[PDB]
Design a protein around this nucleic acid. Structure first.
Ligand SMILES: [Mg+2]
Ligand SMILES: [Mg+2]
Ligand SMILES: [Mg+2]
Ligand SMILES: [Zn+2]
Lengths: 206, 148, 70, 97, 62, 127
RNA sequence: AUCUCUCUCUAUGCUCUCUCUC
């Protein structure tokens, strides 16, 4: 759509309405459906980042961490454990692969699926070692939104990590699968299970 | 792969007495394997592990070892076990131990056959242990009866 | 995996009839659904992709992203 | 030395009076060293009144209040409790604050 | 059962270890209730806070 | 207009009772002991347990006939504590917010005109 | 008249000593 005439060679896709609509590396950053009420500026969406790799300041204020794209945050979380500290390019690649897998399996815009997974993993009721003398007493504490989101993301990544530790399954595919499980259908994913267990524990305590 | 549950039905019941072999300690308690019901993962939340404050965790519970336990919360949909060690009454403990032993014996019986001939394990379980259980309660009792 | 690194004729046939219906096709997937385990799976995948059969999504190696024709 | 000109508490032109058992430790303590905070508190919480007003038979009945004279003895008058410890300089102040 | 309430003011931060926030929760379904709630983690004003707990409340954490 | 019950909350320093009686008190409707609901003995004086018990009582009673309730409250005394312990207020809250109408709250703690020598033994209990 | 309300074990330890000039 509308080829721009240059002396330098530019691909057809770039020429097409990607100049017009600025959504992702060829994915929909629209749709915009958060299942829980509001939750925006805690799960970012909105800002149509092209590739989940932005170098900015997201530790230098209290809540500014929220303005990280969710995909980017996922990538960052993936970037973990010795063999992979730094190497964000790899993480980005893995995320792309995951997205592709999601697209292939049960269709849909993968971003929405990711969002769903984030929503449906994370816990409402949590436990803190309050003490009561330092002993095994844990009062049930409800979780703040941003923190909860972060926790969910971490557990998702953890699931993938667990899956990959000596297996044929490349990280990305496994991650995608677990994300899908988390979203809705089976709920036999690791992260979601863990979250549910935590919630149960919180319920049985005060 | 070798699997399949100890009893007749797939999922554990509320207030079922179990014996738990300790795998690893995390935050809630331990992700233990229930040796009275399949190998489904569950946890003892840090409040119901012992009757009194005993400070030490790796002497009264111990990683690798078995603990006399009871199932508190069960969710018949996917797979969660909220478990207790404290709610097991005095005595009762002996009974639980006996049950565990029986279960172990039953398990021992059902593997030799498999080894001798492969073939699906579920089918084997169906044709050896379950009908008797349904008739009475436990497979070891049935075995005892047979012996008699 | 208990060997299973053979481009067997029967195995090939199975692959041909099991790669459709399922949307996602990969080496890992193949390993999961019990046919070929490892290096020759990749080869099989490659030789399924000459003209048609399974359409590519991936423009990247090491991880394969392939969808059957609808 | 004597910490107080009142030595203990209050026993002047009196002597060897009558004992009270405490709140928490329940110990025998004279009715002067006794320490009496006196608790006036409405039966419910400060935030648990509106709800009651909403759901009741007797509309605009107001509140009953508990009047409990505590005998929080010197010893267990202090854990994170009342009365604290005052400076040997600023101990000669009998005011309620 | 599912409930959710917006936060409006923070009643400081309490805990032996600390970190855990005491919040004043106002329900977006009927604004007549402002309850003292235990919240774990970073929380400001005007945030939707999901609650699995319906009615139980605690102040100090010890 | 309304059927009136009597709550009689015994939320002593250890365990709660929501022993809902008639109006003369001779015949009980439903009791559900506060420490029954949670089988953790640490969580018996806990407000949560009390609240749960109250909710259970409401379920038993509100969905059978009795809509209005006078609330008597006593956390022991005479020789014990003479002070409302943890669990009474919570129970009351639960009663209110389950949906039951309130027919005047009142405290009937047993307060002596000086009693027998209570436990401790002069020097008292040592923490 | 606005408090709100927290929590338990923990035993002992032997190796010196110092002034000036007005
Ligand atoms: Mg005289
Ligand atoms: Mg006694
Ligand atoms: Mg004694
Ligand atoms: Zn005292």
């Amino acid at each position: 759509f509308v080829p721009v005439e240059l002396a330098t060679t530019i691909p057809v896709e770039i020429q097409q309405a990607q100049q017009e609509i600025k959504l992702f590396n060829k994915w929909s950053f629209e749709d915009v459906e958060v299942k829980d009420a509001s939750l925006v500026d805690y799960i970012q969406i909105s800002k149509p980042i092209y590739v989940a790799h932005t170098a900015g300041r997201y530790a230098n204020k209290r809540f500014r961490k929220a303005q990280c794209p969710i995909v980017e945050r996922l990538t960052n979380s993936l970037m973990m454990n010795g063999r992979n500290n730094g190497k964000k390019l790899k993480a980005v690649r893995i995320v792309k692969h995951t997205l592709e897998i999601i697209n292939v399996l049960t269709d849909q815009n993968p971003l929405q699926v990711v969002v769903d997974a984030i929503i449906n993993s994370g816990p409402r009721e949590d436990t803190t070692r309050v003490g009561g003398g330092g002993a095994a007493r844990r009062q049930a504490v409800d979780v703040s939104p941003l923190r909860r989101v972060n926790q969910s993301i971490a557990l998702l990544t953890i699931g993938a990590r667990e899956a990959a530790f000596r297996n044929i399954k490349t990280i990305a595919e496994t991650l995608a699968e677990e994300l899908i499980n988390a979203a809705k259908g089976s709920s036999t994913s690791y992260a979601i299970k863990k979250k549910d267990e935590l919630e149960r524990v919180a319920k049985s305590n005060r | 792969t070798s699997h399949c549950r100890f009893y007749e039905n797939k999922y554990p019941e509320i207030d079922d007495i179990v014996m738990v072999n300790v795998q690893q300690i995390a935050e809630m308690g331990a992700y233990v394997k229930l040796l009275e019901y399949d190998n489904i993962e569950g946890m003892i939340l840090l409040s119901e592990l012992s009757r009194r404050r005993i400070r030490s965790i790796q002497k009264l519970i111990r990683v690798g070892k078995n603990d006399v336990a009871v199932v508190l919360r069960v969710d018949k949909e996917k797979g969660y076990i909220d478990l207790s060690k404290r709610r097991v009454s005095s005595e009762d403990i002996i009974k639980c131990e006996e049950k565990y032993q029986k279960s172990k014996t039953v398990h021992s019986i059902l593997r030799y056959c498999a080894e001798k001939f492969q073939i699906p394990l579920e089918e084997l379980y169906k044709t050896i242990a379950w009908p008797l259980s349904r008739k009475f309660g436990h497979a070891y009792e049935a075995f005892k009866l047979s012996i008699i | 995996a208990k060997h299973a690194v053979v481009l067997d004729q029967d195995k090939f046939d199975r692959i041909m009839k099991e790669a459709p219906t399922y949307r996602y096709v990969s080496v890992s997937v193949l390993v999961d659904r019990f046919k070929l385990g490892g290096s020759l799976a990749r080869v099989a995948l490659r030789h399924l992709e000459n003209e048609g059969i399974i359409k590519p999504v991936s423009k990247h190696s090491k991880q394969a992203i392939y969808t059957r024709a609808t | 030395p004597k910490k107080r000109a009142s030595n203990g508490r209050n026993k002047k032109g009196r002597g060897h009076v009558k004992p009270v058992r405490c709140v928490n430790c329940s110990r025998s303590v004279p009715k002067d060293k006794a320490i009496k905070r006196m608790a006036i508190r409405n039966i419910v919480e400060a935030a648990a009144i509106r709800d009651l007003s909403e759901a009741s038979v007797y509309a605009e009945y107001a509140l009953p209040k508990t009047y409990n004279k505590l005998h929080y003895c010197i010893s267990c008058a202090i854990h994170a409790r009342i009365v604290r410890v005052r400076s040997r300089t600023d101990r000669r102040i009998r005011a309620p604050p | 059962p599912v409930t959710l309430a917006k936060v409006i003011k923070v009643l400081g931060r309490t805990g032996s270890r600390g970190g855990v926030t005491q919040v004043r929760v106002e329900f977006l379904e009927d604004t007549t209730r402002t309850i003292v709630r235990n919240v774990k983690g970073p929380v400001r004003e005007g945030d939707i806070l999901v609650l699995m707990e319906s009615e139980r409340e605690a102040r100090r954490l010890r | 207009s309304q059927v009136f019950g009597v709550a009689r909350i015994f939320a002593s320093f250890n365990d709660t009772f929501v022993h809902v009686t008639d109006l003369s008190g001779r015949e009980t409707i439903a009791r559900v002991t506060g420490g029954m609901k949670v089988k953790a003995d640490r969580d018996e004086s806990s407000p949560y347990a009390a609240m749960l018990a109250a909710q259970d009582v409401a379920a038993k009673c509100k969905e059978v006939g009795i809509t209005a309730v006078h609330i008597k409250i006593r956390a022991t005394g005479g020789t014990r504590s003479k002070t409302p312990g943890p669990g009474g207020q919570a129970a009351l809250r639960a009663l209110a917010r389950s949906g039951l109408r309130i027919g005047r709250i009142e405290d009937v703690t047993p307060v002596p005109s000086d009693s027998t020598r209570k436990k401790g033994g002069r020097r008292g209990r040592r923490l």
